[PDB]
């Protein structure tokens, strides 16, 4: 894990998931607050995943593969989102610098996949 994956970015964001049944965003992991969100590159397989942990209690709130061809939506300068076959994820970044860091890394991953 540490043997196989390298972080390519870390950004400060409140990680949300979309409750489509209720038509509203809810905090990932059930607890509002900011997380440190990484993109990890598994260099052996050339695969990537998003992993986020709450700053306070370190709970893992997001751990999702980045599939080839993903459409990454920069809705605003500080809120970005994407979806999989299961969930819609949203990142409410702590600053535009954090958003640029994460988007830059996500776009690199999507070029490299």
């Amino acid at each position: 894990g540490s043997m196989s994956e390298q972080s390519i970015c870390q950004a400060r964001a409140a990680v949300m998931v979309y409750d489509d049944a209720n038509k509203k965003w809810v905090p990932a992991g059930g607890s509002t607050g900011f997380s440190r969100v990484h993109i990890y590159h598994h260099t052996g397989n050339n695969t990537f995943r998003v992993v986020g942990r709450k700053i306070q209690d370190h709970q893992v709130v997001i751990n999702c593969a980045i599939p080839k061809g993903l459409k990454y939506n920069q809705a605003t300068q500080t809120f970005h989102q994407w979806r999989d076959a299961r969930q819609v994820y949203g990142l409410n970044f702590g600053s535009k610098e954090d958003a640029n860091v994460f988007a830059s890394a996500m776009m690199h991953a999507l070029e490299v996949l």
Binding site: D20, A75, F79, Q81, R83, V88
Partner: peptide, 5 residues
């Protein structure tokens, strides 16, 4: 994609 919160 749904609207931001």
């Amino acid at each position: 994609x749904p609207p931001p919160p």
